Structure formats: C-alpha cells, structure tokens
Paper text:
Among all bacterial pathogens, [name] maintains the largest known set of translocated substrates, delivering over 300 proteins to the host cell via its Type IVB, Icm/Dot translocation system. In at least nine instances, this regulation is direct—a hallmark of an emerging class of proteins called metaeffectors, or “effectors of effectors”. Through detailed structural and functional analysis, we show that metaeffector activity derives from a diverse range of mechanisms, shapes evolution, and can be used to reveal important aspects of each cognate effector's function. After release into the host cell, translocated bacterial substrates (effectors) regulate one another through several different functional interactions: indirectly, through counteracting modification of a shared host target, or directly through either steric complex formation or direct modification of one effector by another.
To that end, we performed detailed structure‐function analysis of a completely uncharacterized set of proteins: the putative metaeffector [name], a leucine‐rich repeat (LRR) protein (de Felipe et al, 2005), and its cognate effector, [name]. After using Y2H and gel filtration analysis to demonstrate a physical interaction between [name] and the N‐terminal domain of [name], we cocrystallized and determined the crystal structure of this novel effector–effector complex. The co‐crystal complex of [name] (blue) bound to [name] (1–226, red) was solved to a resolution of 2.0 Å. The heterocomplex has a 1:1 stoichiometry, with [name] forming a canonical LRR horseshoe‐shaped structure arching over and interacting with the [name] active site identified above. [name] forms a canonical leucine‐rich repeat structure arching over the predicted active site of [name]. The interface spans 1,240 Å2 and is reinforced by [name] K194 projecting into the [name] active site where it forms a hydrogen bond with the predicted catalytic residue C101 (inset). [name] acts as a direct antagonist by blocking the active site of [name].
Numbering used by the authors:
A (entry chain A): 0 to 246
B (entry chain a): 1 to 228
Amino acid sequence: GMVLTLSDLEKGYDKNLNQLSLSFLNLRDNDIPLLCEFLQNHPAITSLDLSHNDITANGVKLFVNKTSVSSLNISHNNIGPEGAQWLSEDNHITTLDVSFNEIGDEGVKALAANAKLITLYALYNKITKVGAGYLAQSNLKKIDLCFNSLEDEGVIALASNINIKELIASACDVSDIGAIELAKNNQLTLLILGKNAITDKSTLHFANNTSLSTLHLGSNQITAAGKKILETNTRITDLDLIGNPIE
Amino acid sequence: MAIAPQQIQERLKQEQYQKFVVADIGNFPHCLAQTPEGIASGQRYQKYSTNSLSRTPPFSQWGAPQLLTPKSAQEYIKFAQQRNKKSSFKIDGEAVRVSECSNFAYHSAGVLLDDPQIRTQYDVAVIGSMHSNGRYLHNITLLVPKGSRLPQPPQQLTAEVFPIGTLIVDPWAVGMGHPPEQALAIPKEQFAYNRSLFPATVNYQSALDESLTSTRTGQLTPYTGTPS
C-alpha cells in the first residue's frame, strides 16, 4: 500500500522460523494486499505478526482466506467486532491473538463459533460475562482473557467448557465464587487468576483439584493460611502467589 | 536550560527498567514483549520466582500492588530511592529490583519529579489507564507541559482533553521488554499501550500538589552511567 514497503517485508521475514513480523509500522488496510501477495510468494510463512498497527475490519476482509497463515498475531489494532467476525471465517487460522482490538462480546461470539480455533488470545477487548458465555460453548483448548471484566458468572460458564486445557484470566473481576467453580473443573492443567478478588476461601478447592499442574493466583487476597492449603497439592509444580498479603 | 524529550528518555534509560523483576509476569504472561529484552525479563522472573529470597522483605512487598496512589511528590522520589538501593539479593550476581503494573509508574514519577528542569517545563501526573468496567488496571506517568490542567475524578481523561505535547512514561512496558521509543517520554502515537490509554483517571497531579514547592530536587542518582 502506501506504508508497507518491500524493505519492511524482507527485514521482517525470519527465514529460519518462517515467520513474518511487521509490528509498529503504522500499517493500514490498504497495505494488506501487498502483504498477502508477499505471503502467497512465500507459502512457507505460516506465522504472522501484524501487532501494533492501524488495521481495521476492512483490512481483515482483505486478509482472510488469502494465505496459509495458521498463526496470526493482530493484537493492538482496531479491527473491532466485525474484524473478529471476519477472522472467524478464516479456514487456516488455529492460533489467534486479537488482544486490544475492542472486539467485544459480539466479536467473541463469532470466534467462539469457529471450531478451527485451538488457541485464542483476547486480552482487553471489553469482553463481559456474555462473551464468556459464548466461549463456554467453543472448542478452544487455550484462552487468554486478561483485562476483561468476565466476573464470576463469566468464569463459571467457562469452567463448564470441557475442551479448555489452559485458561488465563487475570484482572477479570473474579471472586471466590468463580474461582471455586474453576477449581472444581477437572480438565484445566494450567490456570492463571492473578489480580482478582480471590481469598483463602478458594484454596481448599484448589488443594483438592486433581487436574492442575500450574496455578497462578498472584496479587489476590490470599493469606499464609491459604498458601499452606495450596501447598498441600503436590500436583501443582508451578504455584505463583507473589503479591498476596502473606505473613 | 531546556531539556529535550530525548534527554528525558536517556535519563529514564539510565534507570534500566528492563532489568527489573516484573512481578506480575506471573499474572500477565502474554504481556511480555516479542523482544530480546522481553525474553530476558521472562527468564529473570522465573529465577526470581524460584528463589527463596523473593519471599523476604522488602522484595515480597515490592511485588504487592499498592492501590493507594501517593499524593505527595516526596513519596514518589522516595519510591525511586528505595527501589534503587543496593541489597544482598542477587540473581546470577545481579541486583534485584521488583515492581508491577500498578506501582511501576511511581518510580518514573519520582525520577522525573527529582529533576529541576523537568519541574519548570512540565507538570507530572500519575493516571490509572486500561479501563475495564469501572476499574483502571494499569498506572501510567504523564509529563504535561506547564499550564495545561487535567480532569479530576470522577471526570475522565480522554483523547479530546489530552494536552498537546504530553509525554507518556510507562516503565512497566519497558520491564515487559518494549524499547524506550515505545514507552519512555514519548507522544501517545508511539506508545506501546496507546490502544488502552483512554479513558483514564488522574490520581495525582503535581500541579495540584501543594507540597511540591517545598519538595527538593536532585536527590537521586541515575542508576547507571551513559555509554559512549
């Protein structure tokens, strides 16, 4: 287009990793056709980083089903709900980062209906308990939802999703109510719930959890008593409690 | 003697924020930047996390969120002073300084407020950014050119009332691996977290701080020296 250059493309082209990185270049929708042309000329590139640019939903329309890119980072753009809706139509993407795009509950509604998706990063997207409800019906194995006000109702819905193996939901307005239901879940192997309102009340349920091997509960309200309880679970090889009022 | 934004940036670069232990990497793993500095910060956290000294003071509390925003200039300068002081805790022979997404901006505020030239050219502000359902998840330090005021809570700071010439200072972003050009004394257009900047709440304004004039400058020493 008017911004993306051939020089950008070749400097961003990591030939050892077959990865194209074009972050922080102020790319716009009009730059997407040139991008796709380059990717079509180099079909081995299946991982793409377009993060921190100025792409909108129109740029997504110009990208989707053009290439064999299966891993896409388009975080920190402006693709919105419609951009997310469109991405949900892509037939190659299995790992997707749409963090910081204001995709909202409507955006996530479409993505959650895409059975192709295995991993979704969607930090800070104004996703609410309604969006979490949509994701609870998805086939996602991993979801990162940090900085979304999911609330207890949200993560309670997510806890019922038998497919999710890894859930990241820090700073999501989760209390003991939500955390306890996540603790009862028997499929999660990694759970991160930092920066929420979780107390010692949840810790017995995490001590009796049998699925988790990673549990991050940093910067909550857990005390030394909760820590003592959590440490009885020896299945958890990565336990993070940094920032809690311990001792 | 007017100080240039680059000279302000170089001053902040001397603090080596990318060398900090970023304690909430455990909370927000996906906020690690795709950079050599991000890779190093992730490794530094892992070592810190598995080191028993991390659970001893003042390191343990340094990792804990400080929700109450300081209302005196001196507290900020003291924040930076205490964070930089030598300690016995070393990771691979390296001094350990710890912060997180809520208190990290306080350090830079202290550094900036401690320069006599900054205080004549700029008002210093600390804001809560990354708004989510009534909460502001990310604290940022602002350098506002003198004579422009900022909205007081519960009024929000928005792009429309963001003073021209405002510089953003986000050392947490640097701790996470973003280069200075995306986080230290730069216009919002270059800011790594520009997409979550507004709306914001302004929790501290040096222009509204009556203790400022009695607060002294030149208390701090740059954590490192500039290379040639």
